[PDB]
Write a protein that binds this DNA or RNA. Structure first.
Lengths: 93, 103, 317, 202, 174
RNA sequence: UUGACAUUAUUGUCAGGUGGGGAGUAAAGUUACCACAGGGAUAACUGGCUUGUGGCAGUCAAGCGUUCAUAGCGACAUUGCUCGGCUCUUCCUAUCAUACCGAAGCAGAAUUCGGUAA
């Protein structure tokens, strides 16, 4: 977008990022099933958890990707200014 | 009856079952590339399976291509001293991938 | 400088030094841009329309109505149909199973194009592995007389007994033999056909085992084997055809040139019928060859085929 | 074994309208978010048909079918048909225009009725003489206005809504076979400002 | 390789007289190419006369197949008819059945012939007589023992069998 | 049934191939490829169930191994590629909002994570 970028959702240091997404799937989804239930409810239980953690990481990753300014698509001053302050190749890596 | 175990099916699937009248194998349970590790050099090469050779427990499973723990499988070395065969070590019904060790 | 290109073949393609050196000497850098740069095409999709069950003009309609792009090759025969774009399965169409056409390469046509089968006569064979060429034997024949089929593999006869009955040839004595002791079995006076028992084995786009695993020991004994198979082919009759799928000299025009001297009853007539470039005289310190001009050649980049050689012989007494 | 249920209502429309898609070589396909119009344009048109799809969603390519995946109302995508279809003119022009339904129905039908005129201006620009123009259009207040401008820009305008539709949905598949291809086109006619000019009170 | 006995031909000709009618006289009397048939390792092979006459030099272990295979003699003493016979059979068919272009691939995978295909079949068909399946172009697909007569199979619910599959040309994918 | 020789197509010899077709000294093994009828043997009982971090192979490696690291097991890491839905009552917290806090480049606003909290 335009001149400045303060409005970026914060970046968790990959260990805490795991502790956010995995704990949320433990708290927000149902957690208790018997082995004595029908197989259909056992399947649907674990499917719901794999998918919900899937959406979890993706939501956090999408926030990073959309949040940071697309360096080579902004403006020639800013494309080069970020290239001076940060290793532009590594910023794209 | 359908099989709820992970299998490998060869590329001649379109009209292969002569002797497998109603032996349903769903497309979700078909894993094509085994996550094979090399013993002598501690490097893991994720390579496609060519042939299911010898599954213990059942000689039916050898003809179905079932990949239960102890199955010897053929590994494609297109990407590349090497051994062409690998023995599986995990239970792919439980975890995600098929994990094999070369011989 | 040569060794630069030898480092740009054995590393770029991941190739054997033994073959990279033996297939560059007395060959131009232009020819290096022909042969070596053609092993990514990997067999253009031609087809062999079985003339017994249906004519080609009645088979052009059949596939086009199912949305198959078809176009004939140059001059040879309308039988060869180049497939460009199809979504209908390329082996499971009911017309494959009927026996209206067999899926072949363009190199599979010509060793039997050169041979001229006539009515009521017998054709003998030694090594026809799939049986795609014996189809072209017993279709020009129009199912008359005798047609022998042979290969030295019990496992590979299943492709023969599949294709013969699939395409409906009716006159096939498909039997496993040792190809050397063949004149002692019967020795039929009419013509024979031999093709590719080879160690040189051209076009690596088909088999990349050639790319890595061909040493000198293959070139010692396999050219010797196919050399002896000529000495059984000239002891059958009568128009002999011996061919191979190899561009290396130690397979063709060193093996055929042996048997030319070894019997005075051998004549090399004009092999092919339409096109195919002229044959050499000198083969890197080799003999005089003004008689070996007619044994045709084909390249993977001059035409959309897979590089091979044909040699058609005649016997008198 | 097709892609969507929208596939079974053009193969049904061909049989009712003399197999017009069978004879046709080149087709401009609009608004096809699934390929439920290019698949059936492949099984009807002759081999190497060269059919071109335009849709707002970016998605996969299909074998034997070229498909450009961007905007409909811009000049740049009109320069992507100008990028391709200048030498050849389309035999037919398809329209599976449908908005994201669920807002009042008054506007869910009027953004449709708006979309069909923009698809018309991509059609009137790039159609062969005496071709056709098939269109998904909702029955609304401004349907009788669209059938009139169809009537004065085409030869025979026939509405259907064939079987294998929803039966509850307010769809019409109207065909417009025969195209005038005039040298003098009325500029005030084709623009949506004058099209939906409401009839005076009684 | 051997020549058939008196009974062993009769067993074959009866099975061939199940699909072809009394038009089996077309199959043995030609005078130009009289087409004699022989067997190797209990499996009959149909060929031209001379092409089997000169192939009497091949060893029994060295032999694999000979022209057109009809079928093999079973251990119990019957005669099966394999799909490879159809190139000889369909040229002299008696009771012939067609199918849908849509309902072709179900048949080509090993399923039976449903009633869901209605048109012009053969007439005068007995309930348990051998029928030959055609698919535009009259392409032979395989064999079949009929489920019902022609009369009964017209007033039927479309998911009932009209011809039990015996062998189809889809066997050429093995 | 093929070649060589002679008759110089026909006929002979020799040599090469097949040969439970006849003379002399049939049917049988197998079957977890197994398809249909019959006889057996039980299936399907929270023994506190269930939740958020995979599996395979190697790298470390607290100790224990019958002494003990070279009879072997071995945690956390780490390195390898990859049947649905309408309506109400009550309850639970694993809380979306409202209440109060802690951390965060938290200038302000806005926000992200976390704690108490039904």
């Amino acid at each position: 977008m335009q001149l400045s970028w303060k409005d970026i959702p914060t970046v968790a240091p990959a260990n805490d990022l795991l502790d956010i997404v995995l704990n949320r799937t433990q708290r927000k989804t149902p957690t208790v099933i018997r082995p004595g239930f029908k197989i259909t409810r056992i399947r649907a239980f674990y499917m719901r958890k794999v998918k919900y953690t899937g959406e979890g990481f993706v939501e956090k990753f999408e926030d990073i990707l959309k949040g940071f300014p697309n360096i080579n698509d902004v403006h020639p001053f800013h494309r080069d200014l970020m290239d001076t302050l940060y290793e532009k190749n590594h910023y794209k890596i | 009856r359908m099989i709820t175990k992970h299998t490998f099916v060869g590329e001649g699937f379109t009209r292969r079952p002569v002797k497998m009248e109603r032996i349903i194998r769903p497309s979700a349970l078909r894993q094509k590339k085994a996550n094979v590790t090399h013993p002598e050099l501690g490097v893991t090469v994720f390579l496609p399976i060519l042939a299911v050779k010898k599954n213990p427990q059942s000689p039916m499973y050898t003809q179905l291509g079932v990949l239960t723990k102890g199955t010897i499988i053929e590994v494609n070395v297109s990407e590349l001293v090497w051994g062409k065969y690998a023995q599986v070590t995990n239970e792919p019904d439980r975890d995600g991938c098929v994990n094999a060790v070369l011989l | 400088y040569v060794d630069r290109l030898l480092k740009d073949i054995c590393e770029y393609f991941g190739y054997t030094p033994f073959l990279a050196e033996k297939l560059f000497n007395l060959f131009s850098p232009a020819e290096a841009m022909e042969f070596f740069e053609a092993n990514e095409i990997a067999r253009p999709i031609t087809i062999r329309t079985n003339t017994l069950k249906t004519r080609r003009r009645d088979l052009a309609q059949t596939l086009v109505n199912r949305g198959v792009n078809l176009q004939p090759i140059g001059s040879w025969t309308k039988v060869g149909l180049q497939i460009f774009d199809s979504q209908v399965p390329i082996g499971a169409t009911p017309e494959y199973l009927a026996g209206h056409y067999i899926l072949q390469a363009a190199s599979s046509f010509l060793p039997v194009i050169a041979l001229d089968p006539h009515e009521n006569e017998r054709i003998l064979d030694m090594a026809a592995a799939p049986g795609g060429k014996t189809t072209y034997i017993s279709a020009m024949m129009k199912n008359t007389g005798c047609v022998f089929a042979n290969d030295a593999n019990k496992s590979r006869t299943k492709s023969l007994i599949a294709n013969i009955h699939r395409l409906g040839c009716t006159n096939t004595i498909v039997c496993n033999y040792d190809a050397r002791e063949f004149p002692k079995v019967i020795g039929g006076f009419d013509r024979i056909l031999l093709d590719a028992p080879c160690s040189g084995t051209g076009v690596i786009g088909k088999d990349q085992s050639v790319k890595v695993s061909r040493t000198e020991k293959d070139f010692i004994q396999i050219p010797h084997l196919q050399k002896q198979l000529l000495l059984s082919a000239i002891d059958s009759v009568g128009v002999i055809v011996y061919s191979t799928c190899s561009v290396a000299v130690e397979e063709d025009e060193a093996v055929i040139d042996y048997a030319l001297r070894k019997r005075p009853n051998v004549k090399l007539v004009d092999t092919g019928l339409a096109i195919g470039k002229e044959a050499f005289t000198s083969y890197r310190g080799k003999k005089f060859h003004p008689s070996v001009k007619l044994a045709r050649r084909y390249y993977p980049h001059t035409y959309n085929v897979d590089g091979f050689f044909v040699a058609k012989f005649q016997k008198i007494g | 074994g097709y892609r969507a249920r929208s596939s079974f209502k053009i193969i049904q429309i061909n049989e009712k309208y003399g197999h017009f898609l069978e004879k046709s070589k080149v087709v401009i396909d609009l608004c096809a978010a699934p390929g439920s119009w290019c698949q059936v344009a492949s099984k009807l048109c002759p081999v190497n048909s060269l059919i071109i799809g335009v849709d707002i969603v970016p998605m996969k390519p299909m074998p034997n079918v070229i498909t450009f995946q961007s905007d409909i109302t811009t000049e740049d995508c009109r320069s992507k048909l100008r990028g391709y279809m200048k030498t050849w003119k389309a035999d037919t022009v398809l329209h599976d225009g449908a908005p994201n339904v669920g807002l009042g129905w008054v506007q869910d039908a009027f953004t449709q009725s708006q979309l069909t005129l923009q698809a018309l201006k991509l059609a009137v620009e790039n159609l062969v003489v005496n071709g056709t123009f098939v269109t998904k259009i909702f029955r609304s207040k401004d349907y009788n206005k669209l059938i009139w401008v169809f009537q004065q820009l085409f030869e025979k305008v026939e509405a259907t809504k064939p079987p294998a539709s929803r039966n509850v949905s307010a769809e019409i598949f109207v065909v417009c076979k025969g195209f005038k291809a005039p040298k003098r086109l009325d500029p005030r006619l084709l623009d949506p400002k004058e099209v939906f000019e409401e009839l005076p009170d009684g | 390789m051997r020549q058939l006995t008196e009974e062993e031909t009769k067993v074959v000709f009866e099975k061939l007289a199940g699909y072809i009618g009394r038009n089996i006289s077309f199959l043995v009397d030609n005078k130009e190419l009289p087409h004699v048939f022989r067997l190797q390792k209990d499996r009959v092979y149909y060929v031209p006369d001379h092409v089997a006459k000169l192939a009497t030099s091949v060893a029994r272990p060295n032999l694999m197949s000979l022209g057109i295979c009809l079928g093999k003699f079973t251990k119990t003493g019957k005669f099966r008819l394999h799909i490879t016979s159809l190139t000889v059979l369909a040229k002299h068919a008696k009771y012939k059945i067609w199918i849908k272009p849509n309902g072709e691939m179900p048949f080509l995978y090993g399923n039976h012939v449903l009633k869901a295909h209605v048109g012009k079949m053969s007439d005068d068909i007995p309930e348990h007589a051998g029928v030959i399946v055609f698919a535009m172009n009259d392409v032979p697909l395989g064999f079949g023992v009929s489920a019902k007569s022609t009369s009964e199979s017209r007033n039927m619910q479309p998911t009932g069998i009209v011809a039990f599959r015996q062998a189809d040309i889809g066997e050429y994918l093995r």
